[PDB]
Amino acid sequence: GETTDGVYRVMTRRLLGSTQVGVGVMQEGVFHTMWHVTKGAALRSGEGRLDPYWGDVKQDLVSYCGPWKLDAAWDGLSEVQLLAVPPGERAKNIQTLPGIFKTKDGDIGAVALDYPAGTSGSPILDKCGRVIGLYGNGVVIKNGSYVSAITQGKRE
Amino acid sequence: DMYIERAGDITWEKDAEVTGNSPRLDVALDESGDFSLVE
Ligand SMILES: C[n+]1ccc(CN)cc1
Numbered sequence: 001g002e003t004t005d006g007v008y009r010v011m012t013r014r015l016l017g018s019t020q021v022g023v024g025v026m027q028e029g030v031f032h033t034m035w036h037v038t039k040g041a042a043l044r045s046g047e048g049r050l051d052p053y054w055g056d057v058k059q060d061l062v063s064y065c066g067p068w069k070l071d072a073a074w075d076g077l078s079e080v081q082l083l084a085v086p087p088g089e090r091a092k093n094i095q096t097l098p099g100i101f102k103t104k105d106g107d108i109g110a111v112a113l114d115y116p117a118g119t120s121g122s123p124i125l126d127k128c129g130r131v132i133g134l135y136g137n138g139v140v141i142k143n144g145s146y147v148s149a150i151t152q153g154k155r156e
Numbered sequence: 157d158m159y160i161e162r163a164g165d166i167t168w169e170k171d172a173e174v175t176g177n178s179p180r181l182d183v184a185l186d187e188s189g190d191f192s193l194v195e
Contacts, residue, residue: 001160002160002162004162005165005166006162006163006164006165006166007162007163007164007165007166008160008161008162008163009160009161009163010158010159010160011158011159011160011161012157012158012159013157013159014157021158023163024160025166026160027166031160035189036189038158041158042158043158043159043160044157044158044159044160045159045160050160057187057188057189058185058187058188058189059189060189079174081168081169081172083164083166085163085164091163091164092172092173093168093169093172093173094172094173094174094175094176095172095173095174095175096174096175096176096178097176097178098178099177099178099179099180099181100178100179100180100181101181101183101191102180102181102182102183103182103183103184103185104184105185110179110181111176112176112177112178112179113175113176123166125166125167125168126168127168128168129166129167129168131166137189137191138191139181139183139191139192139193141179141181141193147179147181149191
């Protein structure tokens with residue numbers, strides 16, 4: 001199937017019509033998405049099949065055809081862009097200054113942008129166009145707003 | 157049966173729409189990968 005680098009929608013025909021369940025990144029021959037989008041199932045790309053290679057429910061990440069390749073990190077100071085891919089809508093860049101998730105195991109950048117659940121897996125990029133993580137695993141705060149962690153995997 | 161469809165290139169857009177605040181939150185991450193607020 002299509003192996004070209006870029007951002008892709010993850011679709012299913014299991015529900016009514018064709019439904020977008022999430023989004024992912026093809027980089028260096030590896031497909032990267034959040035675990036909650038595919039639940040670790042195999043994927044189709046045209047007539048080809050993409051098998052899972054690595055995954056972790058706690059990190060909420062999964063890679064297909066090879067190991068996780070994304071290793072850029074938010075610098076902790078600069079604005080980033082969410083490359084949002086919403087269901088039935090064109091890919092669109094949104095610039096924002098991340099907030100922070102403070103945890104007992106360290107701090108993580110977080111983006112306070114609210115999109116439909118099917119946008120999960122959309123990439124967050126730095127000014128060099130490098131993917132610093134995936135959008136779609138986060139929390140609902142006091143005033144009811146959604147804040148996503150900038151979730152990034154480890155490149156072995 | 158899940159399938160993928162290309163949606164675009166990954167590139168920074170000059171003059172993209174700029175929005176969103178930057179909240180600083182204390183959170184906890186459980187074994188199922190769910191984040192929750194710590195108050
Ligand atoms: C609750 N919620 C909202 C949006 C997303 C998104 N990508 C994931 C989860």
